Amino acid sequence: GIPMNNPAIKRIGNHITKSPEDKREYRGLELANGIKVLLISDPTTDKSSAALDVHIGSLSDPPNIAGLSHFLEHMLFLGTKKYPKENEYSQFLSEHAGSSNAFTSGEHTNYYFDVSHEHLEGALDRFAQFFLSPLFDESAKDREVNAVDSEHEKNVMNDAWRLFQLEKATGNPKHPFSKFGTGNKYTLETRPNQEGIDVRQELLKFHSAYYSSNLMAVVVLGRESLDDLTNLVVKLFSEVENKNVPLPEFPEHPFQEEHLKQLYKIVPIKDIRNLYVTFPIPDLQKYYKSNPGHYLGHLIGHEGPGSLLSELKSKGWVNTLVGGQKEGARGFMFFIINVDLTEEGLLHVEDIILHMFQYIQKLRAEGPQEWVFQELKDLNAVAFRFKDKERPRGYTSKIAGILHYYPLEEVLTAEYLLEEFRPDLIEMVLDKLRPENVRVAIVSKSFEGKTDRTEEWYGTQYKQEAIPDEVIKKWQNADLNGKFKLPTKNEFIPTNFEILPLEKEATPYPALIKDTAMSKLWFKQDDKFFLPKANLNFEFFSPFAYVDPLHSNMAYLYLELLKDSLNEYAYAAELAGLSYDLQNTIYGMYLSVKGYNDKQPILLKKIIEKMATFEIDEKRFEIIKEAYMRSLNNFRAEQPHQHAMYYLRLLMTEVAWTKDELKEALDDVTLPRLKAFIPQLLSRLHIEALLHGNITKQAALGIMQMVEDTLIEHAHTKPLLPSQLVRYREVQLPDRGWFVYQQRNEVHNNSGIEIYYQTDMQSTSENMFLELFAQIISEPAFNTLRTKEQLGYIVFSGPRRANGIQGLRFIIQSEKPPHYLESRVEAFLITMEKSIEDMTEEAFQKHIQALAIRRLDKPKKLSAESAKYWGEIISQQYNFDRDNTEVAYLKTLTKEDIIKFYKEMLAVDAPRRHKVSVHVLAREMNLSQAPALPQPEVIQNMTEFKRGLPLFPLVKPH
Amino acid sequence: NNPAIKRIGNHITKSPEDKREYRGLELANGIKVLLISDPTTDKSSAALDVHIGSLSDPPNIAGLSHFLEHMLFLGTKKYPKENEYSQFLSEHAGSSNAFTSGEHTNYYFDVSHEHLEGALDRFAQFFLSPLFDESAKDREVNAVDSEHEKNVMNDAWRLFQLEKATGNPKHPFSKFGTGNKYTLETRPNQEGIDVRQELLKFHSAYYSSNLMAVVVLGRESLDDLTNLVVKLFSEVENKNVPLPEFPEHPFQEEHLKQLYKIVPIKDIRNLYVTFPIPDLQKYYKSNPGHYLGHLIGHEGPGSLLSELKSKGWVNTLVGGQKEGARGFMFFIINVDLTEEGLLHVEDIILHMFQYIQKLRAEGPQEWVFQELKDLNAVAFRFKDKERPRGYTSKIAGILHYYPLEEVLTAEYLLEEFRPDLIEMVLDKLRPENVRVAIVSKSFEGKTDRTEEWYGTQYKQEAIPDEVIKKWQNADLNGKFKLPTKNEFIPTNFEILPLEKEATPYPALIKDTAMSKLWFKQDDKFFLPKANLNFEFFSPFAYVDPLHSNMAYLYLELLKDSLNEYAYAAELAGLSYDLQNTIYGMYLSVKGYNDKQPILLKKIIEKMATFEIDEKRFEIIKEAYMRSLNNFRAEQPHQHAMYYLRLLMTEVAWTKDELKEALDDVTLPRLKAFIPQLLSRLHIEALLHGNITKQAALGIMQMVEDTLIEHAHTKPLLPSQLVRYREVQLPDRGWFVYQQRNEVHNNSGIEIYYQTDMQSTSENMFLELFAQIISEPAFNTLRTKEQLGYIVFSGPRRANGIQGLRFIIQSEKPPHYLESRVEAFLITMEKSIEDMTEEAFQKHIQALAIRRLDKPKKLSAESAKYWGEIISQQYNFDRDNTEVAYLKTLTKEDIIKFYKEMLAVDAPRRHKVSVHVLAREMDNLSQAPALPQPEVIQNMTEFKRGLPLFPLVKPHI
Numbered sequence A: 001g002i003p004m005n006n007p008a009i010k011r012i013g014n015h016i017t018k019s020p021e022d023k024r025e026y027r028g029l030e031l032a033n034g035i036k037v038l039l040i041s042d043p044t045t046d047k048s049s050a051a052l053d054v055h056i057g058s059l060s061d062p063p064n065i066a067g068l069s070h071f072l073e074h075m076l077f078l079g080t081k082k083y084p085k086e087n088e089y090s091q092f093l094s095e096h097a098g099s100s101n102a103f104t105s106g107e108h109t110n111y112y113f114d115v116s117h118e119h120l121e122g123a124l125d126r127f128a129q130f131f132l133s134p135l136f137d138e139s140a141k142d143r144e145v146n147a148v149d150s151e152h153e154k155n156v157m158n159d160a161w162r163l164f165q166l167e168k169a170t171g172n173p174k175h176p177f178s179k180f181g182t183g184n185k186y187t188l189e190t191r192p193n194q195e196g197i198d199v200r201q202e203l204l205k206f207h208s209a210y211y212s213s214n215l216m217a218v219v220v221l222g223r224e225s226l227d228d229l230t231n232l233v234v235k236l237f238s239e240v241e242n243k244n245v246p247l248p249e250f251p252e253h254p255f256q257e258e259h260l261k262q263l264y265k266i267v268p269i270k271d272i273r274n275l276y277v278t279f280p281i282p283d284l285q286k287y288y289k290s291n292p293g294h295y296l297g298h299l300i301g302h303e304g305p306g307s308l309l310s311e312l313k314s315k316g317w318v319n320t321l322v323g324g325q326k327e328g329a330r331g332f333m334f335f336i337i338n339v340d341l342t343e344e345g346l347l348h349v350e351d352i353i354l355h356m357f358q359y360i361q362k363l364r365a366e367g368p369q370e371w372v373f374q375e376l377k378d379l380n381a382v383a384f385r386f387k388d389k390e391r392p393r394g395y396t397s398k399i400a401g402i403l404h405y406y407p408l409e410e411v412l413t414a415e416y417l418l419e420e421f422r423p424d425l426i427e428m429v430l431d432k433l434r435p436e437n438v439r440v441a442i443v444s445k446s447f448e449g450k451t452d453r454t455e456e457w458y459g460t461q462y463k464q465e466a467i468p469d470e471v472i473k474k475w476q477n478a479d480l481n482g483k484f485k486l487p488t489k490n491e492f493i494p495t496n497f498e499i500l501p502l503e504k505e506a507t508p509y510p511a512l513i514k515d516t517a518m519s520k521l522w523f524k525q526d527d528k529f530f531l532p533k534a535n536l537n538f539e540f541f542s543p544f545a546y547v548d549p550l551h552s553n554m555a556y557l558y559l560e561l562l563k564d565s566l567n568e569y570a571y572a573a574e575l576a577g578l579s580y581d582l583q584n585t586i587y588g589m590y591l592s593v594k595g596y597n598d599k600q601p602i603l604l605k606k607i608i609e610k611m612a613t614f615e616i617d618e619k620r621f622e623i624i625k626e627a628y629m630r631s632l633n634n635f636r637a638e639q640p641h642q643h644a645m646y647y648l649r650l651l652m653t654e655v656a657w658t659k660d661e662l663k664e665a666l667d668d669v670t671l672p673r674l675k676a677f678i679p680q681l682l683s684r685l686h687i688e689a690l691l692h693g694n695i696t697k698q699a700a701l702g703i704m705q706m707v708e709d710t711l712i713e714h715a716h717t718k719p720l721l722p723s724q725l726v727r728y729r730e731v732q733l734p735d736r737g738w739f740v741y742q743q744r745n746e747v748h749n750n751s752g753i754e755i756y757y758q759t760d761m762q763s764t765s766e767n768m769f770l771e772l773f774a775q776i777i778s779e780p781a782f783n784t785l786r787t788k789e790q791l792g793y794i795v796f797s798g799p800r801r802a803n804g805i806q807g808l809r810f811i812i813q814s815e816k817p818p819h820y821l822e823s824r825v826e827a828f829l830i831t832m833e834k835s836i837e838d839m840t841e842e843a844f845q846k847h848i849q850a851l852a853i854r855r856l857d858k859p860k861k862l863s864a865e866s867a868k869y870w871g872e873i874i875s876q877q878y879n880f881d882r883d884n885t886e887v888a889y890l891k892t893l894t895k896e897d898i899i900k901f902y903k904e905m906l907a908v909d910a911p912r913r914h915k916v917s918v919h920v921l922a923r924e925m926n927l928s929q930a931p932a933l934p935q936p937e938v939i940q941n942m943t944e945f946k947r948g949l950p951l952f953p954l955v956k957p958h
Numbered sequence B: 001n002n003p004a005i006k007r008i009g010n011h012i013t014k015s016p017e018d019k020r021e022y023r024g025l026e027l028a029n030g031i032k033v034l035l036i037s038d039p040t041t042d043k044s045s046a047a048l049d050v051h052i053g054s055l056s057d058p059p060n061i062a063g064l065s066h067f068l069e070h071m072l073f074l075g076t077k078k079y080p081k082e083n084e085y086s087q088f089l090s091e092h093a094g095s096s097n098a099f100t101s102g103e104h105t106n107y108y109f110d111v112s113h114e115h116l117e118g119a120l121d122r123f124a125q126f127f128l129s130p131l132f133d134e135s136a137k138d139r140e141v142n143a144v145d146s147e148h149e150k151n152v153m154n155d156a157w158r159l160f161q162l163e164k165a166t167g168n169p170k171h172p173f174s175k176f177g178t179g180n181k182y183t184l185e186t187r188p189n190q191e192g193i194d195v196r197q198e199l200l201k202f203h204s205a206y207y208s209s210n211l212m213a214v215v216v217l218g219r220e221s222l223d224d225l226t227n228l229v230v231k232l233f234s235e236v237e238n239k240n241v242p243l244p245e246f247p248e249h250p251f252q253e254e255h256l257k258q259l260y261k262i263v264p265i266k267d268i269r270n271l272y273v274t275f276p277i278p279d280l281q282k283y284y285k286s287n288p289g290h291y292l293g294h295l296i297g298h299e300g301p302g303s304l305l306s307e308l309k310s311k312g313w314v315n316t317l318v319g320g321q322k323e324g325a326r327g328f329m330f331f332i333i334n335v336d337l338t339e340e341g342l343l344h345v346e347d348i349i350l351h352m353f354q355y356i357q358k359l360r361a362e363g364p365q366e367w368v369f370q371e372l373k374d375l376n377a378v379a380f381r382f383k384d385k386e387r388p389r390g391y392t393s394k395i396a397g398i399l400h401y402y403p404l405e406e407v408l409t410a411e412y413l414l415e416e417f418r419p420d421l422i423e424m425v426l427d428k429l430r431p432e433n434v435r436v437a438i439v440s441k442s443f444e445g446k447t448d449r450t451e452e453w454y455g456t457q458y459k460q461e462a463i464p465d466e467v468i469k470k471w472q473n474a475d476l477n478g479k480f481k482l483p484t485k486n487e488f489i490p491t492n493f494e495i496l497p498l499e500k501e502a503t504p505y506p507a508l509i510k511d512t513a514m515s516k517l518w519f520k521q522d523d524k525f526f527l528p529k530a531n532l533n534f535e536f537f538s539p540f541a542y543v544d545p546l547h548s549n550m551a552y553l554y555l556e557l558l559k560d561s562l563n564e565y566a567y568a569a570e571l572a573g574l575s576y577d578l579q580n581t582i583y584g585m586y587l588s589v590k591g592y593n594d595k596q597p598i599l600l601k602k603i604i605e606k607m608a609t610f611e612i613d614e615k616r617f618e619i620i621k622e623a624y625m626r627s628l629n630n631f632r633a634e635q636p637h638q639h640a641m642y643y644l645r646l647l648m649t650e651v652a653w654t655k656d657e658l659k660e661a662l663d664d665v666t667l668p669r670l671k672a673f674i675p676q677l678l679s680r681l682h683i684e685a686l687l688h689g690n691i692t693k694q695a696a697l698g699i700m701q702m703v704e705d706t707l708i709e710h711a712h713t714k715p716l717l718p719s720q721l722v723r724y725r726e727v728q729l730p731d732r733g734w735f736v737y738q739q740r741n742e743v744h745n746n747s748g749i750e751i752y753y754q755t756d757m758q759s760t761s762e763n764m765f766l767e768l769f770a771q772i773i774s775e776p777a778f779n780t781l782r783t784k785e786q787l788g789y790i791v792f793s794g795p796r797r798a799n800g801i802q803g804l805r806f807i808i809q810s811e812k813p814p815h816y817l818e819s820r821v822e823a824f825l826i827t828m829e830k831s832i833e834d835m836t837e838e839a840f841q842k843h844i845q846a847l848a849i850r851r852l853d854k855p856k857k858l859s860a861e862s863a864k865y866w867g868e869i870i871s872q873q874y875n876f877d878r879d880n881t882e883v884a885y886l887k888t889l890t891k892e893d894i895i896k897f898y899k900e901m902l903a904v905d906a907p908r909r910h911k912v913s914v915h916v917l918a919r920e921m922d923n924l925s926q927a928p929a930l931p932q933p934e935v936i937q938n939m940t941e942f943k944r945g946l947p948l949f950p951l952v953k954p955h956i
């Protein structure tokens, strides 16, 4: 018997291919209006999510209003005909454990949210109206244009944004690739008013022309059955109208013949040295089952023995290299080889590029390698079989984007599984990588003064020249270079995926399975995810890692040099799903090893061994010290609000060496001094570790003792004493005091501010007071301070936690001066007092449930669980059951409890107000009533400030 | 003229730099008297010396004259209020003490200068009509017993008495002088002796005016002083007592050529060589014994010590004449021993007799004696002005030995060379007269004798005549040579004129990233001396126990290295001290300014280019090891104060931590350590004395330059110059930390009531309260309840915080002591409310005199300033401002402060207690009920659970 067509559904897909470890259920379908849909049923999930991706972006901006797609994307959050309250959507999510975001690329506008699983339909309904009846309210439009402006101002002095638009500006000016996608106040308000454009109409016109159901893909993830998810999506999206808009295509490359063989010289904001080599290529998107571009990126970008980078690095010319295909749009793509440049490298760019074309020539000479393709296919297959389970919010968003590019039944696999070996396509692409098609850009402060052009949106200073034909000919004549050998088989490829059975003595949280002078070992056998992976986390404590700027510098360089020398060896492991991280900390060193457990012990032993028997190469020492010197200086160019947060940490921590102190001490770091420092640092240690995943208790102990034994044999390590295991305490602010610390950001023309209302040590009581209060003001502060007052793009509120202490913080980056932002934050706090008093007991209990859902949201993947435990461990609070305990307590809080808290600790008149503010001034630097504020005490000297105040205790361990 | 004065001495010879006025006189009753007029002194003083002591104890009552000395403090026929003397002194900014030696009992006090007569009157009655109250007698016997108890396990007292016990048992020299409850009560009771009768008998028989000397210092004219001393003291009855003599020496020939092996308490290795010698006191004008001690005890090139040290056998040596009594003396050569030295005692002594033999061969050297004469002369001329209390007590002791006109000079000014006397004494220093004692734990379990009074385990044996003979045949040893002419003798005594912009207080005259230089030209004392004070701050001096050990060993090794060179300087009045601190290094050079720059450059120069001698490094490391272990044998109240300091300070390494880290100090590790330590520094200095501002900058510059040139020093960052904070105790908290002393069978306790950060008001609340409870605390906890010999109350200052503290060492449990102190605090609460307004004002005045007392010598002023500098408070005018504020305090202010900070129910009471249990450890005013104490098990946890105070703000 033939079935019964639902008329709202053009078709239902066949089985969506998924990993056999993936327990979510899936159904694809196409609505009658052409919307492509993936439904994801996951009855376990605590949060539900949905995303919609429209296949229109800023490449289809009207030529006379740069940034319109982007601006429209902001305006859709601000109210619809069915839900006309400007913040209904944001407010609804915030009160039901939810959040949302959206972004505009060249061909896509992508909207997404998550929310408590009980409130999917309510969230989805408010969401759907975005695509049916936006208000584009005239007042809202006049305000939100500032957020977009503020967003662009954030980027103006950022080198990656400048370089991104400079590339767009050096191609064909008549090509949509050359448009400026962000927009700003000039392009979205100023000029349109000069020109008599009515921007609200332009918004309605763009929404109506391009927000067509036939360019739309939606993904919905919830607890509901696939059948119920289907009815829900049909109900809500069937009415999007189908205007059968053709999908924009860009078959002509933005780089035509007069844009090839060009050389660009560019002045950075930071002191950086980069070389960017670009070739235009055809659109490879449709070859996704062979991926010729990624084959060549894998080789040209390889970092192992025989590689291009390996030789460029041996020559002292480059330290990092990125190679492979770069996205463009439907119709064109790029192929890049970007490196950073040592001082010598900047003088040998021509040779660097010759070496690139010699490596490319080696690939031509050998021809395509099925075995290489086979490794890529095998590693991808394994990565997909054992893929970590994603957070729903990011997952709906990602999948909505790629429903445009693949058949329903392959949306999950298309980007992972390779199927076809295509030596023809590999040769096709390789043939485009030739000197006659190359574009070259050099970024260096050394061009400062010698430029004669100005990119118009960012101000970038640059010069353009034709590459001399004799240079082109010398590159065309690259003969083979014996240093370049293809990679050999990857012996880090894992093969043992067995999941060890759960030991009888296994525990729901990490157990302390070893407690000695040398080492404290926390262990948990994974009992949730059952993927063949493990995480190994080691905190090494030494007093000599941070005792003085000089030692801090030496701890940094030791680990940078170590990673630098392990890099060729560890790259094979990286490719094979096994990675590691090694940083210095204010207490010693941090070492993390993650991925397939199979060959982890081999890599870990290689790392510890190399630590304990370090052999510094002087050439690397000089190069890496020079790069570190630049890195310290380049901090001057970070965002104002980043500066604000950095200064706060300095002020409120017992010991903290500043960038300038570090920088001044760096000149006295000599190779001999560093050689002496390493054994001193390794001579005494404490090791605290978390080992968590597909490993037994015996393996964990063996792993821990192997790290121990290696340090003992080669570095003669002995334990530290317990009295040496100290931690930095937080400055304890005086009741109702208010300190202000002011600095200037000499690069960005915005200001930044962080405001910290210190409350008390962490404890069940105090944590949940602060967290519940932060939940209640979260949406209001964003809606007041950004959406309505438009103080800036970056507006943030929430708990601050450090050294066992806590408080409430606001962070804002703005065009206005810090003193103004203070009064506006104080004005906002006052209003919240009445708001909480007047809140019904039902509303109060609603915010409690929001917070409870967020705090009890179980982690989806092993790494998320490890990070939770690791936080409990390095905080030395060891409170692994914290969520149940604190939520249980939260559920007993009353709004009276919260109002007492606010009036004791936060209100402007509170007896126990502890306020410190960092004001970062810009480089050049009705409404509700702001309260009157005391005269602030101005910190001129951090050392005196700390010397003059008490220091908090540390929290008691659990 | 006047019947009460037998004679008035002539001009008392003094130093031309001494502005005090002097008059001597003998009273008709035979009391020798020196009077001292100093119209500037803030405190006046008197002292009385009775030429009777322990040697004259009744043979059946050991310690009577010592016990008598205590009993004199406890009331007289004219002032029968038991604590009248102490109370009068305390309420008038005074203090007092007394000691009993073998032939002297010496009593002294000081007091506010406006109250000399009232103090002296009460004083005089000690020697007219003591009560010897029976009740008081039965209490105070415990203070004496407790005094003996603290000594029992002290190695210096055990050996002191063991020498006496190995001489002639029939000789007074063998008497047990301290006494204890057994000899002063238990045995006299079982033998039927009335101790009170015996005290009265002893006092009547020997406290005779003919044996007394009296010294009085005050602002009054010499005439008024003469009238006051006549009034109070001519009353003393003269019984014409013969001065006891001891002509026969306690060591006869059966006590010679003897060898003693002694087991110590601490881990120490010592060799004591003793010779009997005739009494040399009458030869004091030529001083043969001191001439010989100067040479035998010399530490410079060619000396006896120098060769013993380079053979790796000995580290320190002491030589010269040792007092005994009228009739007998000793000559000693004492060394400590290395592990090798312990195995070579025979040869160590041979080397001794070789050096003695060379002195015989060369014969006496007048140029040596002439050098001593001339140095002593300079030392006397520029002698620092003494504090009254110590000066009167010193003089009263020597008035018995020298004529009045020469009493100030007799101990300094040598007369003519007497080589015959030197050859006579030297003739006694022969193997056939020697006594040898070795102290080493290696004799543990190898001894067969027990000294009665202290329990010391030892063995005695005769030195074999084959060994005597080898020593008698000691050849001359080329390694021994007389000292060379002292090149450090000062010769420029010019007092530089006060620059026109000199300061009353030190001035910050240099302030760079590397140096803070505080300078003041001396404007009070005008002696040709200077004090030079340097703090070298470095984070690596104390970052961990290994680095603290290495800072210590570095400075010990450096001093060990400099010693031969610096001994000449020390002999010429030019000395230095160099010691590691928790922030870095401290260097002090003091003395005659003439040659100072030579010594200072040498020191800074050896610091920056030091080359460790491996044999020294091993020897000093082993000694440091023993030093850390030997802390176990310190006294309970010392252990108490050490634990408290550990508990209340941010960072502090314990002896076990230092001792364990020590095995990891290798010679290579130490060599790498020093350049690291020196690589970055900050120098804060006080230069104070006979120097100009330009000279000061020059000295600072030479220091900086020497470090920069040789150690490449560079400045520290301001943010690295951090100082440790004090643990901040919670309101209404009570913490207790308990430890055992494994060696002493007493217990100790420190009780700390932390109040608040230092500040004018909090400082003077605490100091006024201290001043008000000082005497009542001593009288209640010692005199009346007799909790023990050591009882102390007062302020505690550390790291800018302060509080009130009680220290007691007792036989009673630490918790019993707690309740008795708590009881005492309650009774003090009543006393303070009952106190009259005139009493309260007396206490304000007493504290004001104490605080405003001006320094008498450069070093004392220097130290006042240095305290402002290292404490980073820089409050050079503190005393005036703080006393000004003190005077406005009211009795109700102090009551409010007590009930807020100190009372058992105070809301801001902050109490921590250290309880040190004795080795074998497990009516009266009512003690309050006490909270349950929080018991500290782990200092780290304890400190990682409390806040830390701020640091105090500098003044400017």
Ligand SMILES: O=C(C[C@@H](Cc1ccc2cccnc2c1)n1cc(CNC(=O)c2ccc(F)c(F)c2)nn1)NO
Binding pocket: A070, A073, A074, A075, A077, A078, A090, A091, A094, A100, A101, A102, A103, A104, A151, A778, A779, A780, A782, A783, A787, A795
């Ligand atoms: O720039 C972009 C990203 C934009 C997208 C956007 C644009 C306009 C909006 C207007 C009102 C609400 N959301 C909006 C979001 N974006 C994302 C965020 C992050 N959200 C918060 O921090 C936040 C926190 C707590 C809240 F209660 C809350 F409502 C927000 N901020 N801006 N795309 O081009």
Ligand SMILES: O=C(C[C@@H](Cc1ccc2cccnc2c1)n1cc(CNC(=O)c2ccc(F)c(F)c2)nn1)NO
Binding pocket: B066, B069, B070, B071, B073, B074, B086, B087, B090, B096, B097, B098, B099, B100, B147, B774, B775, B776, B778, B779, B783, B791
């Ligand atoms: O032992 C010794 C030394 C003895 C001498 C001695 C013996 C018995 C005494 C009885 C009552 C009063 N003084 C006495 C003194 N001594 C010295 C000290 C030090 N004085 C204080 O600490 C103190 C502090 C504040 C006061 F108000 C106060 F009165 C005393 N304690 N004992 N000689 O043999």
Ligand SMILES: [Zn+2]
Binding pocket: A070, A074, A148, A151
């Ligand atoms: Zn945006």
Ligand SMILES: [Zn+2]
Binding pocket: B066, B070, B144, B147
């Ligand atoms: Zn005594």
